[PDB]
């Protein structure tokens, strides 16, 4: 009946960079997924209390969501594109771990992940 602290979006102890790939990840990848009709479940940490999913954070130990990714990108939290790509894949993975195949939420994750994959296919060279 309690949500964990969300993932950090700011860490002054963490070295940070602005690379053209990270810019792509914000301006193209995030923006494309964020605007999608199916983005809303993924635009903020899972509120396991409001969704009455007390076991969500028992099962999901590496939570990730696009709200967090967005803030991280906006805050230049990352060092490289792979960190950010990993966050996206963590988000998708958590969905597929927690839910069943064919669940609406999985279909939404899959639709977003298809766009994710299409966009990162044209990730520019550094
Ligand atoms: C069904 O479980 C999930 C729910 C959500 C979001 C729900 C919402 O914002 O209402 C996100 C990921 C999940 O795996």
Tab-separated table of N, CA, C and O and ligand atoms in Angstrom:
chain	number	residue	atom	x	y	z
A	1	UNK	N	0.822	-1.205	0.000
A	1	UNK	CA	0.000	0.000	0.000
A	1	UNK	C	0.860	1.260	0.000
A	1	UNK	O	0.391	2.345	0.363
A	2	UNK	N	2.124	1.118	-0.398
A	2	UNK	CA	3.022	2.257	-0.520
A	2	UNK	C	3.867	2.103	-1.774
A	2	UNK	O	4.353	1.011	-2.066
A	3	UNK	N	4.025	3.205	-2.522
A	3	UNK	CA	4.909	3.197	-3.676
A	3	UNK	C	6.345	3.476	-3.250
A	3	UNK	O	6.578	4.175	-2.262
A	4	UNK	N	7.322	2.941	-3.971
A	4	UNK	CA	8.709	3.258	-3.667
A	4	UNK	C	9.033	4.670	-4.111
A	4	UNK	O	8.262	5.276	-4.872
A	5	UNK	N	10.144	5.234	-3.644
A	5	UNK	CA	10.663	6.452	-4.254
A	5	UNK	C	10.834	6.226	-5.742
A	5	UNK	O	11.269	5.141	-6.158
A	6	UNK	N	10.490	7.199	-6.577
A	6	UNK	CA	10.674	7.027	-8.015
A	6	UNK	C	12.152	6.964	-8.349
A	6	UNK	O	12.993	7.325	-7.512
A	7	UNK	N	12.521	6.518	-9.552
A	7	UNK	CA	13.940	6.548	-9.924
A	7	UNK	C	14.452	7.979	-9.913
A	7	UNK	O	13.712	8.919	-10.188
A	8	UNK	N	15.730	8.140	-9.590
A	8	UNK	CA	16.297	9.475	-9.571
A	8	UNK	C	16.370	10.013	-10.991
A	8	UNK	O	16.622	9.272	-11.949
A	9	UNK	N	16.118	11.306	-11.121
A	9	UNK	CA	16.266	12.026	-12.375
A	9	UNK	C	17.372	13.056	-12.294
A	9	UNK	O	17.635	13.754	-13.270
A	10	UNK	N	18.004	13.173	-11.139
A	10	UNK	CA	19.027	14.162	-10.890
A	10	UNK	C	20.010	13.529	-9.930
A	10	UNK	O	19.598	12.882	-8.967
A	11	UNK	N	21.289	13.678	-10.215
A	11	UNK	CA	22.341	13.145	-9.350
A	11	UNK	C	23.600	13.932	-9.637
A	11	UNK	O	24.317	13.633	-10.599
A	12	UNK	N	23.906	14.958	-8.835
A	12	UNK	CA	25.126	15.738	-9.096
A	12	UNK	C	26.399	14.929	-9.002
A	12	UNK	O	27.421	15.373	-9.522
A	13	UNK	N	26.379	13.759	-8.369
A	13	UNK	CA	27.550	12.892	-8.335
A	13	UNK	C	27.738	12.089	-9.617
A	13	UNK	O	28.734	11.368	-9.737
A	14	UNK	N	26.817	12.187	-10.572
A	14	UNK	CA	26.873	11.345	-11.759
A	14	UNK	C	27.352	12.177	-12.936
A	14	UNK	O	26.707	13.180	-13.256
A	15	UNK	N	28.467	11.839	-13.588
A	15	UNK	CA	28.891	12.617	-14.760
A	15	UNK	C	27.820	12.585	-15.842
A	15	UNK	O	27.082	11.614	-15.988
A	16	UNK	N	27.729	13.676	-16.582
A	16	UNK	CA	26.639	13.903	-17.518
A	16	UNK	C	27.206	14.412	-18.836
A	16	UNK	O	28.245	15.074	-18.863
A	17	UNK	N	26.493	14.127	-19.919
A	17	UNK	CA	26.873	14.599	-21.235
A	17	UNK	C	25.630	14.926	-22.033
A	17	UNK	O	24.542	14.396	-21.787
A	18	UNK	N	25.821	15.802	-23.004
A	18	UNK	CA	24.865	16.043	-24.074
A	18	UNK	C	25.534	15.514	-25.333
A	18	UNK	O	26.544	16.068	-25.778
A	19	UNK	N	25.021	14.420	-25.877
A	19	UNK	CA	25.516	13.913	-27.146
A	19	UNK	C	24.409	13.981	-28.190
A	19	UNK	O	23.222	14.040	-27.862
A	20	UNK	N	24.805	13.969	-29.465
A	20	UNK	CA	23.791	14.036	-30.511
A	20	UNK	C	22.840	12.847	-30.429
A	20	UNK	O	21.648	12.985	-30.725
A	21	UNK	N	23.333	11.694	-29.984
A	21	UNK	CA	22.449	10.545	-29.800
A	21	UNK	C	21.451	10.791	-28.683
A	21	UNK	O	20.274	10.438	-28.812
A	22	UNK	N	21.900	11.374	-27.566
A	22	UNK	CA	20.943	11.647	-26.501
A	22	UNK	C	19.931	12.692	-26.950
A	22	UNK	O	18.743	12.596	-26.616
A	23	UNK	N	20.371	13.675	-27.740
A	23	UNK	CA	19.428	14.640	-28.296
A	23	UNK	C	18.392	13.938	-29.159
A	23	UNK	O	17.191	14.240	-29.075
A	24	UNK	N	18.843	12.993	-29.988
A	24	UNK	CA	17.933	12.178	-30.783
A	24	UNK	C	16.962	11.427	-29.889
A	24	UNK	O	15.763	11.359	-30.178
A	25	UNK	N	17.459	10.899	-28.771
A	25	UNK	CA	16.619	10.105	-27.884
A	25	UNK	C	15.505	10.942	-27.277
A	25	UNK	O	14.413	10.425	-27.001
A	26	UNK	N	15.758	12.235	-27.079
A	26	UNK	CA	14.744	13.146	-26.570
A	26	UNK	C	13.861	13.675	-27.694
A	26	UNK	O	12.635	13.550	-27.641
A	27	UNK	N	14.474	14.287	-28.710
A	27	UNK	CA	13.709	14.997	-29.732
A	27	UNK	C	12.936	14.053	-30.634
A	27	UNK	O	11.859	14.416	-31.123
A	28	UNK	N	13.461	12.859	-30.900
A	28	UNK	CA	12.799	11.907	-31.789
A	28	UNK	C	12.152	10.770	-31.006
A	28	UNK	O	10.933	10.595	-31.050
A	29	UNK	N	12.946	9.996	-30.263
A	29	UNK	CA	12.433	8.759	-29.674
A	29	UNK	C	11.417	9.060	-28.582
A	29	UNK	O	10.273	8.596	-28.629
A	30	UNK	N	11.826	9.813	-27.562
A	30	UNK	CA	10.892	10.098	-26.477
A	30	UNK	C	9.656	10.822	-26.995
A	30	UNK	O	8.518	10.430	-26.702
A	31	UNK	N	9.865	11.884	-27.778
A	31	UNK	CA	8.740	12.669	-28.278
A	31	UNK	C	7.759	11.803	-29.062
A	31	UNK	O	6.541	11.977	-28.946
A	32	UNK	N	8.268	10.852	-29.847
A	32	UNK	CA	7.398	9.979	-30.628
A	32	UNK	C	6.589	9.064	-29.727
A	32	UNK	O	5.386	8.869	-29.930
A	33	UNK	N	7.239	8.461	-28.742
A	33	UNK	CA	6.499	7.577	-27.858
A	33	UNK	C	5.557	8.377	-26.979
A	33	UNK	O	4.420	7.959	-26.737
A	34	UNK	N	6.016	9.531	-26.496
A	34	UNK	CA	5.236	10.300	-25.529
A	34	UNK	C	3.888	10.701	-26.098
A	34	UNK	O	2.889	10.745	-25.374
A	35	UNK	N	3.847	11.021	-27.390
A	35	UNK	CA	2.624	11.545	-27.974
A	35	UNK	C	1.665	10.444	-28.371
A	35	UNK	O	0.519	10.738	-28.712
A	36	UNK	N	2.105	9.192	-28.304
A	36	UNK	CA	1.326	8.066	-28.790
A	36	UNK	C	0.063	7.897	-27.958
A	36	UNK	O	0.020	8.228	-26.763
A	37	UNK	N	-0.985	7.393	-28.610
A	37	UNK	CA	-2.252	7.177	-27.917
A	37	UNK	C	-2.089	6.240	-26.730
A	37	UNK	O	-2.855	6.320	-25.760
A	38	UNK	N	-1.104	5.347	-26.784
A	38	UNK	CA	-0.913	4.341	-25.748
A	38	UNK	C	0.146	4.735	-24.726
A	38	UNK	O	0.531	3.903	-23.896
A	39	UNK	N	0.611	5.990	-24.749
A	39	UNK	CA	1.728	6.378	-23.892
A	39	UNK	C	1.313	6.533	-22.436
A	39	UNK	O	2.139	6.328	-21.542
A	40	UNK	N	0.050	6.867	-22.170
A	40	UNK	CA	-0.297	7.363	-20.840
A	40	UNK	C	0.036	6.408	-19.696
A	40	UNK	O	0.422	6.906	-18.625
A	41	UNK	N	-0.073	5.075	-19.821
A	41	UNK	CA	0.324	4.226	-18.683
A	41	UNK	C	1.794	4.331	-18.361
A	41	UNK	O	2.203	3.988	-17.243
A	42	UNK	N	2.597	4.797	-19.309
A	42	UNK	CA	4.047	4.785	-19.200
A	42	UNK	C	4.631	6.167	-18.967
A	42	UNK	O	5.864	6.307	-18.899
A	43	UNK	N	3.781	7.182	-18.801
A	43	UNK	CA	4.258	8.553	-18.678
A	43	UNK	C	4.642	8.921	-17.251
A	43	UNK	O	5.062	10.047	-17.014
A	44	UNK	N	4.506	7.997	-16.309
A	44	UNK	CA	4.853	8.258	-14.921
A	44	UNK	C	5.042	6.922	-14.226
A	44	UNK	O	4.565	5.894	-14.715
A	45	UNK	N	5.741	6.903	-13.091
A	45	UNK	CA	5.885	5.651	-12.338
A	45	UNK	C	4.537	4.995	-12.100
A	45	UNK	O	3.505	5.663	-11.994
A	46	UNK	N	4.551	3.666	-12.056
A	46	UNK	CA	3.323	2.930	-11.781
A	46	UNK	C	2.870	3.272	-10.376
A	46	UNK	O	3.622	3.102	-9.407
A	47	UNK	N	1.652	3.790	-10.260
A	47	UNK	CA	1.075	4.067	-8.950
A	47	UNK	C	0.380	2.793	-8.504
A	47	UNK	O	-0.823	2.591	-8.720
A	48	UNK	N	1.156	1.930	-7.858
A	48	UNK	CA	0.643	0.635	-7.436
A	48	UNK	C	-0.441	0.777	-6.382
A	48	UNK	O	-1.278	-0.117	-6.231
A	49	UNK	N	-0.433	1.871	-5.630
A	49	UNK	CA	-1.488	2.075	-4.647
A	49	UNK	C	-2.809	2.373	-5.345
A	49	UNK	O	-3.822	1.700	-5.111
A	50	UNK	N	-2.810	3.366	-6.230
A	50	UNK	CA	-4.043	3.733	-6.916
A	50	UNK	C	-4.545	2.620	-7.829
A	50	UNK	O	-5.753	2.483	-8.033
A	51	UNK	N	-3.645	1.845	-8.413
A	51	UNK	CA	-4.043	0.742	-9.275
A	51	UNK	C	-4.356	-0.518	-8.496
A	51	UNK	O	-4.695	-1.531	-9.106
A	52	UNK	N	-4.228	-0.484	-7.174
A	52	UNK	CA	-4.519	-1.640	-6.338
A	52	UNK	C	-3.715	-2.846	-6.818
A	52	UNK	O	-4.242	-3.933	-7.061
A	53	UNK	N	-2.415	-2.624	-6.993
A	53	UNK	CA	-1.466	-3.658	-7.392
A	53	UNK	C	-0.407	-3.744	-6.303
A	53	UNK	O	0.754	-3.365	-6.514
A	54	UNK	N	-0.777	-4.217	-5.112
A	54	UNK	CA	0.199	-4.248	-4.015
A	54	UNK	C	1.428	-5.062	-4.337
A	54	UNK	O	2.479	-4.806	-3.741
A	55	UNK	N	1.355	-6.009	-5.275
A	55	UNK	CA	2.511	-6.843	-5.592
A	55	UNK	C	3.382	-6.277	-6.704
A	55	UNK	O	4.390	-6.904	-7.061
A	56	UNK	N	3.029	-5.116	-7.255
A	56	UNK	CA	3.763	-4.610	-8.409
A	56	UNK	C	5.240	-4.438	-8.082
A	56	UNK	O	6.114	-4.933	-8.803
A	57	UNK	N	5.543	-3.740	-7.001
A	57	UNK	CA	6.938	-3.515	-6.672
A	57	UNK	C	7.539	-4.647	-5.858
A	57	UNK	O	8.722	-4.579	-5.494
A	58	UNK	N	6.756	-5.683	-5.570
A	58	UNK	CA	7.348	-6.944	-5.144
A	58	UNK	C	7.955	-7.671	-6.330
A	58	UNK	O	9.013	-8.293	-6.208
A	59	UNK	N	7.309	-7.573	-7.488
A	59	UNK	CA	7.782	-8.234	-8.700
A	59	UNK	C	8.728	-7.346	-9.496
A	59	UNK	O	9.735	-7.827	-10.021
A	60	UNK	N	8.423	-6.057	-9.611
A	60	UNK	CA	9.230	-5.134	-10.400
A	60	UNK	C	10.210	-4.446	-9.459
A	60	UNK	O	9.826	-3.573	-8.676
A	61	UNK	N	11.483	-4.827	-9.548
A	61	UNK	CA	12.520	-4.250	-8.703
A	61	UNK	C	13.372	-3.210	-9.421
A	61	UNK	O	14.157	-2.516	-8.772
A	62	UNK	N	13.238	-3.061	-10.730
A	62	UNK	CA	13.905	-1.985	-11.451
A	62	UNK	C	12.845	-1.213	-12.209
A	62	UNK	O	12.712	-1.356	-13.428
A	63	UNK	N	12.050	-0.408	-11.503
A	63	UNK	CA	10.988	0.360	-12.164
A	63	UNK	C	11.565	1.376	-13.134
A	63	UNK	O	12.598	1.986	-12.875
A	64	UNK	N	10.877	1.570	-14.252
A	64	UNK	CA	11.268	2.629	-15.163
A	64	UNK	C	10.035	3.031	-15.950
A	64	UNK	O	9.142	2.219	-16.175
A	65	UNK	N	9.986	4.304	-16.323
A	65	UNK	CA	8.836	4.864	-17.007
A	65	UNK	C	9.322	6.042	-17.832
A	65	UNK	O	10.424	6.550	-17.620
A	66	UNK	N	8.479	6.485	-18.770
A	66	UNK	CA	8.875	7.562	-19.669
A	66	UNK	C	8.884	8.922	-18.992
A	66	UNK	O	9.576	9.832	-19.469
A	67	UNK	N	8.081	9.112	-17.944
A	67	UNK	CA	8.203	10.337	-17.170
A	67	UNK	C	9.600	10.478	-16.612
A	67	UNK	O	10.262	11.507	-16.783
A	68	UNK	N	10.089	9.407	-15.990
A	68	UNK	CA	11.463	9.383	-15.504
A	68	UNK	C	12.456	9.588	-16.642
A	68	UNK	O	13.365	10.422	-16.543
A	69	UNK	N	12.281	8.856	-17.744
A	69	UNK	CA	13.187	9.014	-18.878
A	69	UNK	C	13.163	10.445	-19.390
A	69	UNK	O	14.209	11.032	-19.691
A	70	UNK	N	11.970	11.020	-19.507
A	70	UNK	CA	11.845	12.389	-19.986
A	70	UNK	C	12.642	13.344	-19.106
A	70	UNK	O	13.460	14.133	-19.597
A	71	UNK	N	12.432	13.266	-17.794
A	71	UNK	CA	13.153	14.146	-16.885
A	71	UNK	C	14.650	13.909	-16.985
A	71	UNK	O	15.432	14.865	-17.049
A	72	UNK	N	15.062	12.639	-17.047
A	72	UNK	CA	16.482	12.319	-17.186
A	72	UNK	C	17.053	12.948	-18.447
A	72	UNK	O	18.110	13.588	-18.410
A	73	UNK	N	16.333	12.818	-19.571
A	73	UNK	CA	16.779	13.424	-20.827
A	73	UNK	C	16.818	14.944	-20.725
A	73	UNK	O	17.815	15.579	-21.090
A	74	UNK	N	15.717	15.545	-20.267
A	74	UNK	CA	15.682	16.985	-20.049
A	74	UNK	C	16.785	17.445	-19.101
A	74	UNK	O	17.420	18.480	-19.337
A	75	UNK	N	17.033	16.698	-18.027
A	75	UNK	CA	18.069	17.070	-17.065
A	75	UNK	C	19.473	16.674	-17.499
A	75	UNK	O	20.411	16.863	-16.718
A	76	UNK	N	19.644	16.148	-18.709
A	76	UNK	CA	20.935	15.640	-19.176
A	76	UNK	C	21.549	14.686	-18.163
A	76	UNK	O	22.741	14.722	-17.897
A	77	UNK	N	20.721	13.801	-17.614
A	77	UNK	CA	21.173	12.874	-16.580
A	77	UNK	C	22.125	11.829	-17.127
A	77	UNK	O	22.940	11.266	-16.383
A	78	UNK	N	22.023	11.528	-18.407
A	78	UNK	CA	22.757	10.399	-18.933
A	78	UNK	C	24.160	10.805	-19.343
A	78	UNK	O	24.447	11.969	-19.645
A	79	UNK	N	25.034	9.808	-19.358
A	79	UNK	CA	26.322	9.915	-20.016
A	79	UNK	C	26.247	9.508	-21.479
A	79	UNK	O	26.857	10.162	-22.331
A	80	UNK	N	25.524	8.433	-21.795
A	80	UNK	CA	25.471	7.954	-23.163
A	80	UNK	C	24.078	7.456	-23.516
A	80	UNK	O	23.198	7.272	-22.662
A	81	UNK	N	23.902	7.226	-24.818
A	81	UNK	CA	22.612	6.789	-25.324
A	81	UNK	C	22.227	5.434	-24.757
A	81	UNK	O	21.048	5.174	-24.512
A	82	UNK	N	23.207	4.555	-24.543
A	82	UNK	CA	22.886	3.198	-24.112
A	82	UNK	C	22.196	3.196	-22.751
A	82	UNK	O	21.270	2.409	-22.520
A	83	UNK	N	22.626	4.067	-21.839
A	83	UNK	CA	21.922	4.199	-20.563
A	83	UNK	C	20.446	4.474	-20.794
A	83	UNK	O	19.570	3.872	-20.163
A	84	UNK	N	20.160	5.404	-21.694
A	84	UNK	CA	18.781	5.795	-21.933
A	84	UNK	C	18.021	4.684	-22.632
A	84	UNK	O	16.893	4.357	-22.249
A	85	UNK	N	18.627	4.096	-23.664
A	85	UNK	CA	18.034	2.938	-24.324
A	85	UNK	C	17.731	1.839	-23.313
A	85	UNK	O	16.673	1.203	-23.367
A	86	UNK	N	18.648	1.600	-22.378
A	86	UNK	CA	18.403	0.591	-21.351
A	86	UNK	C	17.183	0.947	-20.509
A	86	UNK	O	16.393	0.069	-20.138
A	87	UNK	N	17.016	2.228	-20.187
A	87	UNK	CA	15.848	2.633	-19.412
A	87	UNK	C	14.558	2.271	-20.145
A	87	UNK	O	13.632	1.706	-19.556
A	88	UNK	N	14.482	2.610	-21.437
A	88	UNK	CA	13.318	2.253	-22.246
A	88	UNK	C	13.078	0.748	-22.238
A	88	UNK	O	11.953	0.284	-22.015
A	89	UNK	N	14.127	-0.037	-22.491
A	89	UNK	CA	13.960	-1.487	-22.495
A	89	UNK	C	13.561	-2.012	-21.120
A	89	UNK	O	12.774	-2.959	-21.014
A	90	UNK	N	14.087	-1.412	-20.052
A	90	UNK	CA	13.641	-1.782	-18.714
A	90	UNK	C	12.151	-1.537	-18.557
A	90	UNK	O	11.422	-2.378	-18.013
A	91	UNK	N	11.683	-0.390	-19.040
A	91	UNK	CA	10.264	-0.082	-18.966
A	91	UNK	C	9.435	-1.127	-19.688
A	91	UNK	O	8.427	-1.621	-19.159
A	92	UNK	N	9.818	-1.453	-20.923
A	92	UNK	CA	9.066	-2.460	-21.662
A	92	UNK	C	9.133	-3.801	-20.951
A	92	UNK	O	8.112	-4.464	-20.738
A	93	UNK	N	10.338	-4.193	-20.551
A	93	UNK	CA	10.550	-5.478	-19.894
A	93	UNK	C	9.686	-5.626	-18.654
A	93	UNK	O	9.108	-6.694	-18.415
A	94	UNK	N	9.595	-4.572	-17.846
A	94	UNK	CA	8.799	-4.650	-16.629
A	94	UNK	C	7.360	-4.936	-16.964
A	94	UNK	O	6.698	-5.723	-16.285
A	95	UNK	N	6.859	-4.271	-17.995
A	95	UNK	CA	5.497	-4.504	-18.433
A	95	UNK	C	5.284	-5.965	-18.803
A	95	UNK	O	4.298	-6.589	-18.392
A	96	UNK	N	6.215	-6.535	-19.570
A	96	UNK	CA	6.032	-7.908	-20.025
A	96	UNK	C	6.233	-8.900	-18.894
A	96	UNK	O	5.614	-9.974	-18.888
A	97	UNK	N	7.075	-8.549	-17.925
A	97	UNK	CA	7.257	-9.381	-16.741
A	97	UNK	C	5.995	-9.385	-15.899
A	97	UNK	O	5.497	-10.442	-15.492
A	98	UNK	N	5.471	-8.195	-15.603
A	98	UNK	CA	4.387	-8.124	-14.642
A	98	UNK	C	3.073	-8.616	-15.229
A	98	UNK	O	2.273	-9.230	-14.514
A	99	UNK	N	2.821	-8.368	-16.508
A	99	UNK	CA	1.506	-8.649	-17.065
A	99	UNK	C	1.520	-9.923	-17.914
A	99	UNK	O	2.540	-10.585	-18.081
A	100	UNK	N	0.386	-10.262	-18.435
A	100	UNK	CA	0.205	-11.464	-19.234
A	100	UNK	C	0.250	-11.114	-20.712
A	100	UNK	O	-0.084	-9.992	-21.091
A	101	UNK	N	0.664	-12.036	-21.583
A	101	UNK	CA	0.561	-11.769	-23.021
A	101	UNK	C	-0.884	-11.494	-23.405
A	101	UNK	O	-1.808	-12.154	-22.929
A	102	UNK	N	-1.078	-10.506	-24.269
A	102	UNK	CA	-2.408	-10.141	-24.703
A	102	UNK	C	-3.137	-9.169	-23.803
A	102	UNK	O	-4.157	-8.615	-24.225
A	103	UNK	N	-2.658	-8.947	-22.579
A	103	UNK	CA	-3.185	-7.854	-21.774
A	103	UNK	C	-3.075	-6.552	-22.550
A	103	UNK	O	-2.097	-6.330	-23.261
A	104	UNK	N	-4.092	-5.696	-22.414
A	104	UNK	CA	-4.069	-4.397	-23.077
A	104	UNK	C	-2.755	-3.668	-22.819
A	104	UNK	O	-2.144	-3.115	-23.739
A	105	UNK	N	-2.300	-3.665	-21.562
A	105	UNK	CA	-1.087	-2.932	-21.224
A	105	UNK	C	0.115	-3.481	-21.990
A	105	UNK	O	0.995	-2.719	-22.411
A	106	UNK	N	0.133	-4.789	-22.246
A	106	UNK	CA	1.216	-5.392	-23.025
A	106	UNK	C	1.108	-4.994	-24.490
A	106	UNK	O	2.119	-4.738	-25.152
A	107	UNK	N	-0.114	-4.963	-25.030
A	107	UNK	CA	-0.310	-4.483	-26.395
A	107	UNK	C	0.136	-3.039	-26.533
A	107	UNK	O	0.697	-2.645	-27.561
A	108	UNK	N	-0.122	-2.229	-25.510
A	108	UNK	CA	0.350	-0.850	-25.523
A	108	UNK	C	1.872	-0.788	-25.473
A	108	UNK	O	2.505	-0.084	-26.269
A	109	UNK	N	2.481	-1.518	-24.540
A	109	UNK	CA	3.937	-1.601	-24.504
A	109	UNK	C	4.501	-2.051	-25.845
A	109	UNK	O	5.512	-1.516	-26.318
A	110	UNK	N	3.879	-3.059	-26.457
A	110	UNK	CA	4.397	-3.578	-27.719
A	110	UNK	C	4.316	-2.530	-28.815
A	110	UNK	O	5.249	-2.384	-29.616
A	111	UNK	N	3.212	-1.781	-28.857
A	111	UNK	CA	3.072	-0.746	-29.870
A	111	UNK	C	4.126	0.333	-29.675
A	111	UNK	O	4.774	0.763	-30.633
A	112	UNK	N	4.330	0.761	-28.433
A	112	UNK	CA	5.382	1.728	-28.147
A	112	UNK	C	6.755	1.158	-28.471
A	112	UNK	O	7.620	1.861	-29.010
A	113	UNK	N	6.982	-0.113	-28.127
A	113	UNK	CA	8.300	-0.697	-28.346
A	113	UNK	C	8.590	-0.847	-29.826
A	113	UNK	O	9.739	-0.683	-30.251
A	114	UNK	N	7.564	-1.129	-30.629
A	114	UNK	CA	7.767	-1.150	-32.074
A	114	UNK	C	8.246	0.207	-32.581
A	114	UNK	O	9.154	0.281	-33.417
A	115	UNK	N	7.633	1.289	-32.101
A	115	UNK	CA	8.071	2.625	-32.498
A	115	UNK	C	9.455	2.919	-31.961
A	115	UNK	O	10.300	3.479	-32.668
A	116	UNK	N	9.685	2.579	-30.696
A	116	UNK	CA	11.020	2.686	-30.125
A	116	UNK	C	12.057	2.047	-31.038
A	116	UNK	O	13.037	2.687	-31.438
A	117	UNK	N	11.836	0.783	-31.394
A	117	UNK	CA	12.782	0.060	-32.234
A	117	UNK	C	12.937	0.728	-33.592
A	117	UNK	O	14.052	0.852	-34.111
A	118	UNK	N	11.828	1.157	-34.188
A	118	UNK	CA	11.926	1.823	-35.479
A	118	UNK	C	12.786	3.075	-35.378
A	118	UNK	O	13.667	3.303	-36.217
A	119	UNK	N	12.596	3.865	-34.315
A	119	UNK	CA	13.344	5.113	-34.175
A	119	UNK	C	14.813	4.858	-33.842
A	119	UNK	O	15.706	5.490	-34.423
A	120	UNK	N	15.093	3.950	-32.899
A	120	UNK	CA	16.495	3.748	-32.554
A	120	UNK	C	17.244	3.063	-33.684
A	120	UNK	O	18.476	3.138	-33.732
A	121	UNK	N	16.540	2.456	-34.631
A	121	UNK	CA	17.197	1.937	-35.819
A	121	UNK	C	17.931	3.031	-36.579
A	121	UNK	O	18.943	2.757	-37.227
A	122	UNK	N	17.449	4.271	-36.512
A	122	UNK	CA	18.128	5.388	-37.160
A	122	UNK	C	18.832	6.295	-36.155
A	122	UNK	O	19.036	7.482	-36.426
A	123	UNK	N	19.191	5.763	-34.997
A	123	UNK	CA	20.022	6.503	-34.068
A	123	UNK	C	21.262	6.989	-34.813
A	123	UNK	O	21.949	6.174	-35.450
A	124	UNK	N	21.539	8.290	-34.826
A	124	UNK	CA	22.693	8.775	-35.585
A	124	UNK	C	23.988	8.280	-34.966
A	124	UNK	O	24.052	7.948	-33.783
A	125	UNK	N	25.026	8.205	-35.790
A	125	UNK	CA	26.354	7.933	-35.259
A	125	UNK	C	26.815	9.121	-34.423
A	125	UNK	O	26.410	10.256	-34.662
A	126	UNK	N	27.650	8.857	-33.421
A	126	UNK	CA	28.027	9.931	-32.493
A	126	UNK	C	28.756	11.098	-33.173
A	126	UNK	O	29.876	10.979	-33.670
B	1	LIG	C1	-1.225	-3.185	-15.590
B	1	LIG	O1	0.031	-2.960	-15.004
B	1	LIG	C2	0.678	-1.799	-15.448
B	1	LIG	C3	0.023	-0.571	-15.377
B	1	LIG	C4	0.668	0.565	-15.834
B	1	LIG	C5	-0.006	1.937	-15.749
B	1	LIG	C6	-1.275	2.060	-15.430
B	1	LIG	C7	-1.897	3.461	-15.321
B	1	LIG	O2	-1.236	4.533	-15.499
B	1	LIG	O3	-3.106	3.548	-15.015
B	1	LIG	C8	1.959	0.482	-16.341
B	1	LIG	C9	2.615	-0.737	-16.413
B	1	LIG	C10	1.969	-1.876	-15.963
B	1	LIG	O4	2.626	-3.104	-16.031
